[PDB]
Design a protein around this ligand. Structure first.
Ligand SMILES: [Zn+2]
Length: 118
């Protein structure tokens, strides 16, 4: 297998959360400066970032200083997910995490991305 996701909490110069989905055989990734929306209605900024390799999904530890992405990475949540809709501008999925669960949607507009919870 079932596709999985991870939300990493990243203590970098700006403390943020990275949402990564196993998708297109890579980790499709977004930085969430204010984290995952925890209830319906909440609209959180999602910043599209570079694909990561699948093996990074279980990573925890310190990215060293002077490297792009420096800081401590921990797993904030993780689980399988079921993809429900996908186009170049919308990704809707059922998350099976311990914190992030139920349906969520990533949307792309001319100003970037947003993450919302059903
Ligand atoms: Zn990060």
């Amino acid at each position: 297998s079932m596709p999985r996701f991870v939300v990493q909490e990243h203590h970098a110069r700006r403390l943020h959360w990275d949402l990564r989905l196993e998708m297109d055989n890579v980790l499709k990734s977004w930085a969430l400066p204010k984290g995952v929306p925890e209830k319906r209605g909440v609209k959180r900024l999602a910043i599209e970032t570079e694909d990561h390799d699948l093996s990074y999904i279980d990573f925890e530890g310190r990215i060293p200083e002077g490297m792009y992405g420096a800081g401590e990475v921990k797993i904030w949540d993780s689980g399988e997910y079921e993809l429900l809709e996908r186009t170049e501008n919308k990704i809707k999925f059922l998350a099976k995490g311990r914190k992030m669960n139920g349906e969520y949607v990533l949307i792309k507009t001319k100003v970037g991305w947003l993450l919302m919870k059903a």
